[PDB]
């Protein structure tokens, strides 16, 4: 549970897990995803019901499911959770699509 390498293809579905939120129900938590070069980063929420067809939705267990990750969606995924103890759980998952930009940021 720390910077996991995940390979994917443009238009292919991909799922991510957030170290902290078990099979439990959809509780309080924040979701963030960084893609593109720098101006493509978007904030994901536990309420993806609807726009899922446009982007993706968040699982009830605190996970992330994508219907089709595009080349623009390529980048790094970051998730955060909060336990009853007061401590927060961090989770970073690296995602790579088929086609690449070429030059790094």
Swiss-Prot record:
What molecular functions are annotated in GO for this chain? advanced glycation end-product receptor activity; amyloid-beta binding; DNA binding; histone binding; identical protein binding; laminin receptor activity; molecular adaptor activity; protein-containing complex binding
The UniProt keywords, alphabetically, are:
Cell membrane, Cell projection, Disulfide bond, DNA damage, DNA repair, DNA replication, DNA-binding, Endosome, Glycoprotein, Immunoglobulin domain, Inflammatory response, Membrane, Nucleus, Phagocytosis, Phosphoprotein, Receptor, Repeat, RNA-binding, Secreted, Signal, Transmembrane, Transmembrane helix, Ubl conjugation
The entry's localization annotation reads: Cell membrane; Cell projection, Phagocytic cup; Early endosome; Nucleus
On whether Cell division is a keyword of this UniProt record, the answer is: no
> Chief localization class?
membrane
- Gene Ontology annotations of biological process type: astrocyte activation; cell surface receptor signaling pathway; cellular response to amyloid-beta; glucose mediated signaling pathway; induction of positive chemotaxis; inflammatory response; learning or memory; microglial cell activation
According to its UniProt record, in which tissues is this protein expressed? Endothelial cells. Increased expression in pre-term labor and preeclampsia placentas compared to controls.
Q: Where is the Ig-like V-type domain?
A: 3-96
PTM per UniProt?
Phosphorylated on its cytoplasmic domain by PKCzeta/PRKCZ upon ligand binding. Phosphorylated by ATM following DNA damage.
Q: What induces it?
A: Induced in T cells by antigen stimulation and by the S100B ligand. Induced in trophoblasts by DNA damage.
Give the disulfide map. 18-79
UniProt feature coiled coil, ranges: none
Q: Which residues are glycosylated?
A: 5, 61
**Could you give one GO CC term from the UniProt record?**
apical plasma membrane
What functional role does this protein have? Cell surface pattern recognition receptor that senses endogenous stress signals with a broad ligand repertoire including advanced glycation end products, S100 proteins, high-mobility group box 1 protein/HMGB1, amyloid beta/APP oligomers, nucleic acids, histones, phospholipids and glycosaminoglycans. Advanced glycosylation end products are nonenzymatically glycosylated proteins which accumulate in vascular tissue in aging and at an accelerated rate in diabetes.
- Subunit and interaction comment: Constitutive homodimer; disulfide-linked. Forms homooligomers. Interacts with S100A1 and APP. Interacts with S100B, S100A12 and S100A14. Interacts with TIRAP. Interacts with HMGB1. Interacts with LGP2; this interaction plays an important role in AGER-mediated pro-inflammatory responses and cytokine release. Interacts with double-strand break repair protein MRE11 which is a core component of the MRN complex. The interaction enhances MRE11 endonuclease activity and promotes DNA repair.
Give the protein name, as stated in the record.
Answer: Advanced glycosylation end product-specific receptor
Q: What is the lineage of its organism?
A: Eukaryota, Metazoa, Chordata, Craniata, Vertebrata
Coverage of the whole protein, first to last residue? 23 to 125 of 404
């Amino acid at each position: 549970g720390s910077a996991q390498n995940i390979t994917a293809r443009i238009g292919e579905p991909l799922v991510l897990k957030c170290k902290g939120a078990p099979k439990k129900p959809p509780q309080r938590l924040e979701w963030k995803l960084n893609t593109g070069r720098t101006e493509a980063w978007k904030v994901l929420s536990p309420q993806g019901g609807g726009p899922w067809d446009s982007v993706a939705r968040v699982l009830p267990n605190g996970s992330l499911f994508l219907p089709a990750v595009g080349i623009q969606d390529e980048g790094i995924f970051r998730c955060q959770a909060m336990n009853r103890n007061g401590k927060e759980t961090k989770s970073n998952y690296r995602v790579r699509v088929y086609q690449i930009p070429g030059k790094p940021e």
